[PDB]
From Swiss-Prot:
It comes from Rattus norvegicus (Rat). Part of the SNARE core complex containing SNAP25, VAMP2 and STX1A; this complex constitutes the basic catalytic machinery of the complex neurotransmitter release apparatus. The SNARE complex interacts with CPLX1. Interacts with STXBP1. The interaction with STXBP1 promotes assembly of the SNARE complex. Interacts (via C-terminus) with KCNB1 (via C-terminus); the interaction increases in a calcium-dependent manner and induces a pore-independent enhancement of exocytosis in neuroendocrine cells, chromaffin cells, pancreatic beta cells and from the soma of dorsal root ganglia (DRG) neurons. The chain crosses the membrane at residues 87-109. The gene is Stx1a. Expressed predominantly in cerebral cortex, hippocampus, cerebellum, adrenal medulla and retina with weak expression detected in non-neuronal tissues. The chain holds residues 183 to 288 of 288 of the full protein. It comes from the Eukaryota. Belongs to the syntaxin family. The record marks K74, A75 as: (Microbial infection) Cleavage. There is a cross-link at K73, K74, K77 (Glycyl lysine isopeptide (Lys-Gly) (interchain with G-Cter in SUMO)). This is Syntaxin-1A.
């Protein structure tokens, strides 16, 4: 609810405005990924040797995290499958706390 006005409460106001940006994102994503396709082709072939190291970087996280998620969660789960989704749930959730620092970092804002 807001009804006209709502200056400061723009966030919640513009929030729904994501329904109009959805299309924009898809469209711009086609013209973007399309071109970039050739760009990423550069580091993929030549600098691929370096960019690769980005992959193996995963095994690292899962290495420590595995022992972290087991402690943080206090230890209470079933199957090691979690370690899979946890990457998107926990390791990602941690970022949320950092993202805020971004807007305030001066980079975005």
């Amino acid at each position: 609810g807001s009804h006209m006005d709502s200056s400061i409460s723009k966030q919640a106001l513009s929030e729904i405005e994501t329904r109009h940006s959805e299309i924009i994102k898809l469209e711009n994503s086609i013209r973007e990924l399309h071109d970039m396709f050739m760009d990423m082709a550069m580091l993929v072939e030549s600098q691929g040797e370096m960019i690769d190291r980005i992959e193996y970087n995963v095994e690292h996280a899962v290495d420590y995290v595995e022992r972290a998620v087991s402690d943080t969660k206090k230890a209470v789960k079933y199957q090691s499958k979690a370690r899979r989704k946890k990457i998107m749930i926990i390791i990602c959730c941690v970022i949320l706390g950092i993202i805020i620092a971004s807007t305030i970092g001066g980079i975005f804002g």
